[PDB]
């Protein structure tokens, strides 16, 4: 199945305060009004990076696995909420072909009513996570509107990634592309609107 | 960075000739401002009671409650709105410019064209307008007979200037453009510090931390080359931009002399219509002229002739033209219909009737 | 010297640039935390047999070497490829610590490209090693009465170990001309053997604990670093500064800005960094540049006098007779209450001249004499007489015609 | 040698650009001097302050090295006196105005 | 060429401010032409005689 992204999935590209200003940036972004794949799990490609989101009220979705093989031959990220908080490991796991939770260690770390949105990207050996948590009034699709995703963690691990899978109900997957965006910062230094410069000739004009 | 400074010396005179160039541009801006406004020898000021024949300058004369700017100059001052960079002050402050426009304006109102040619010789404003009418070939009685109408048309026309300037910022587009181009140029000059120019990094302390001396010196010389080309590009563009402003200050200084301090015969130099006078107002980085002009507004067709026959003599008009209402012939001035009977004083004789192509038979009254 | 002349005409000349120099250097980094647990390497009660040498890998942590080199505890401390004093400034992808027990005479085998029973059969270092070696006498820890035969080393091997090669294989060694059948015999031996350590032995036969430190750096990220030092923080003065990786120089001050909880720097429209968060106490500081500007000398010309006044353009006299103009701090000129035509221009309505024992004076310029024109309703002024006037006007019309042959200017002959 | 060529070429392009900008400033002055000669010397200008201060009578050119000098001859009114004045006078019920 | 284009971005603003300068000169030619010819308000015609 498929759904429109609308204006969703913009994140703060750097740890810099800017106020009452418009800033032009090139980065891996989800393009405006693009297709995102909709699901109710498969192994999926990672490409340049992933936008991920789900609509939730019951904690059916627990975490993610990332790597090249996604199985034993080499190191792989395992990221899980232990129902207290997030846990992270990077071992060469020989885990299940249908992995779930019920309804070697070179690094390790410890941290519907909700839409929970995330962005994953891996650049020069640092793995980046951004997120936002927000209320909702629709189950079938991503809500049309704007709110920027803030950073969570920034992990020096060097591991290659080409595939991922989600630990188990409605969720959405979209792929980042190298795009130029114009970002609007308000008086309090939050991003509050954006323009995808390649979207249409009016956006190129802006 | 003292390490970078020791390499920059190898380029020699370049940093001195860039400052010598920008100093010439900065020193010129005070000459431009002086040549427009400082055309008056003494700081004239207005009588206490404003008996200017019913004309109303209250919106262009000073207001002492405010700097001492006029009401219109306060609209004009509202409608336009450190990596080694500095901004120098002007020599004449915005209060000194408003004293010069006040002196030029108070001399103009109280003494006409005369204060540009010697001492300010006082003359009543109703008579100053009479000689400004007589200067466009409209006979001076046409003012005094219509003085209340003319004063009301002037007082009304100044009111429309206040409304036009109150309504939009797009009135002062030329001055806001000069402000915007200098901001666009400086933001460009500073944003160019973020560029690599082929070096390993745009930051000198990053280069100096990553690399040993002989390698760091080669990466720094790429930043020196690119930043020096970036500054030479700015100075060249400011020299060309200042030449356009100098050409405009030479024109504004010429409209001060020929068109505020005088009355101009030059067509469409001092606005459209036959020019009577104009008033200077100051604005941010500029001057504003309120050009006052006679425009003819309703017209009627007449039969006309180059001469009239009398006793076999051809008579030609001294001042004016011959016209007929259909039954009678009159002579009028050209720019306003005032018909007068044709007489030996209004007309001059030259030769017999038979030469002139299109002469008419009529009568000359001899008083 | 600026003009390359011994005579100077009347004017104002820029002779220099002024700049407030930094009074001190500030460094700020986060509170020193995730210090690596070297007690597992050096202070464990257990220790390894040298054939089975125990390696610790350190990652995602801050590792102090100054506690290692300043400690009096060690009977030897050595380093190869690196200065021991420099270690605390460095960062690495991984750091390794290799730990074992040997007799005190054999500690000299743990060195770059060296040879012998311990080097070639137990623990080997390359001919260009980058790292350090640390050792101490462990006779009270590792010896026992009756002989501690529980410590082992490889006495026999088929071939020498490669650099850093680890080997716990039990392969029986054949010294003789007849095969082993997988067990000892005449000149056939089990490879691992003991010193039998006792407290009474001479220092060459007493046990020593040994640690070897090795360093690794890759395009994989520098997960280990030495500890980061920080100074006190100084507000309201021109200082050189470093916050995390951001170097600069400026007047640091308190500010009203509200960064979001993840933001660390603040930027102007022109990219220019204009505020920072202190990583130790999470306040936001404004950065403003240390005061600078042209220095100009105001002179009545060296024909008339040797007095001068100095203008520090845009500078305030706090930063530098002395007088604060709106053009900048002016020094050596007397402020005057009168006003005159502008002789030497300074800026913002101020000019200077040389006037009455005479001195340089600075004043607000006079635009001209005021004149209330004697206007009236019914009165006119008419001139009774005239002057013919002759006015000189000069205009330039042409430059000196010049040509430059660029083939000869760039490279003559 | 290519470092010397690169520096000397940029040094000469900087000079030629500023001489092109200065030649346009001197041309704008030579076009004004040519206009002052036609209108002030060959004529009598009515243009206020164009040919000196005061009401212009005539002017004379004198040559100078790299330029020109105009000696502008003008009439300046000098000894003003106050009078009472009127726009018109009544005679036999009709207003007379000065011709 | 994509290999060259990625190097040219390291020189920053230069290429944009050259396109902007030539675009300003192009727009000025249509202004120069209207300052001269477009001084008349109405398209006047001569009579047939
Ligand atoms: C000449 O034109 C003016 C336009 O201003 C006419 O003046 C106005 O006349 C009306 C009556 O028709 C008055 O109510 C207005 O007050 C006048 N205007 C002003 C500014 O006072 C004038 O009537 C015209 N005269 C002729 C003979 O056509
Ligand atoms: C206007 O009046 C004069 C004087 O009557 C006309 O003069 C002509 O003079 C010659 C002299 O030889 C006579 O032969 C003609 O008979 C006169 N003309 C007429 C119409 O009688 C003159 O021609 C008249 N002009 C016009 C334009 O009618
Ligand atoms: C870094 O360490 C300092 C010092 O412990 C922390 O600042 C406060 O210091 C005072 C004593 O001067 C204590 O009473 C407070 O409990 C400390 N904490 C706070 C929140 O005030 C500082 O917070 C530490 N910073 C970080 C980022 O850990
Ligand atoms: C992409 O978007 C179109 C509508 O624009 C939709 O029909 C289609 O199903 C979406 N998915 C794919 C893979 O094309
Ligand atoms: C994994 O990443 C490293 C980064 O240095 C690279 O050398 C290697 O080719 C990558 N392998 C794959 C399969 O992407
Ligand atoms: C910004 O912060 C202020 C408090 O400083 C708060 O009142 C305001 O609601 C915030 N949001 C916006 C959009 O200004
Ligand atoms: C002039 O016009 C103003 C309004 O613009 C009015 O207040 C004033 O009374 C008028 N008369 C005089 C003599 O100022
Ligand atoms: C003048 O004459 C022409 C031609 O007969 C006519 O079109 C026009 O309306 C007339 N009236 C005026 C006021 O021009
Ligand atoms: C005007 O034209 C008519 C018709 O051709 C002619 O009779 C007349 O003489 C002309 N008048 C003038 C003033 O040229
Ligand atoms: C070992 O232990 C002592 C006592 O607890 C401690 O002071 C010392 O710093 C430790 N040394 C190392 C190298 O860990
Ligand atoms: C000069 O600096 C002092 C100290 O900051 C301040 O009191 C004074 O107002 C400043 N004056 C000017 C004109 O900058
Ligand atoms: C100028 O005169 C005023 C009169 O109040 C006085 O305050 C000031 O001190 C005087 N300054 C000098 C330099 O004489
Ligand atoms: C003209 O008369 C007034 C009032 O008597 C006087 O102030 C003024 O000085 C006189 N001007 C001349 C030029 O005599």
Numbering used by the authors:
A (entry chain C): 27 to 66, 81 to 143, 165 to 172, 186 to 242, 263 to 300
B (entry chain C): 746 to 811, 813 to 827, 855 to 1140
C (entry chain B): 301 to 620, 641 to 676, 689 to 745
D (entry chain B): 993 to 1091
E (entry chain A): 746 to 794
Quote from the publication:
Changes in the spike (S) glycoprotein in these variants are under scrutiny because the S protein has a central role in engaging the angiotensin-converting enzyme 2 (ACE2) receptor to mediate cellular entry and is a dominant target of neutralizing antibodies (nAbs) elicited by either vaccination or natural infection. The prefusion SARS-CoV-2 S trimer is composed of S1 and S2 subunits separated by a furin cleavage site. The S1 subunit contains the N-terminal domain (NTD), ACE2 receptor binding domain (RBD), and two subdomains (SD1 and SD2). The RBD transitions between a “closed” (“down”) receptor-inaccessible conformation and an “open” (“up”) conformation that allows binding to the ACE2 receptor.
The B.1.1.7 variant emerged in the UK in September 2020 and spread worldwide, with reports of increased transmissibility, virulence, and mortality. B.1.1.7 spike affinity for ACE2 was improved over the D614G spike by a factor of ~5 as a result of the N501Y substitution. Multiple populations of the 3-RBD-down and RBD-up states were identified, with a higher proportion of RBD-up particles observed for the B.1.1.7 spike (~1.8:1 RBD-up/RBD-down) relative to the D614G spike (~0.8:1) and the mink-associated ΔFV spike (~1.3:1). We identified several RBD-up structures, including a typical 1-RBD-up state and two 1-RBD-up populations with the up RBD and its adjacent NTD disordered. We next sought to understand how variations that are distal from the RBD/NTD region influence the B.1.1.7 spike conformational distribution. These variations spanned multiple domains including SD1 [Ala570 → Asp (A570D)], SD2 [Pro681 → His (P681H)], HR1 [Ser982 → Ala (S982A)], CD [Asp1118 → His (D1118H)], and the linker between SD2 and fusion peptide [Thr716 → Ile (T716I)]. By contrast, the T716I substitution abrogated an intraprotomer hydrogen bond (H-bond) between the Thr716 side-chain and Gln1071 main-chain carbonyls, suggesting a local destabilizing effect. The A570D substitution resulted in an interprotomer H-bond with the Asn856 side chain, reinforcing the stacking of the SD1 loop against the HR1 helix of the adjacent protomer. The HR1 S982A substitution, on the other hand, resulted in the loss of an interprotomer H-bond between the Ser982 and Thr547 side chains. Thus, the S982A mutation appears to disable a latch that modulates the RBD up/down equilibrium, thereby increasing RBD up propensity. In B.1.1.7, amino acid substitutions that destabilize the 3-RBD-down or closed state to favor RBD-up or open states are balanced by substitutions that stabilize the prefusion spike conformation.
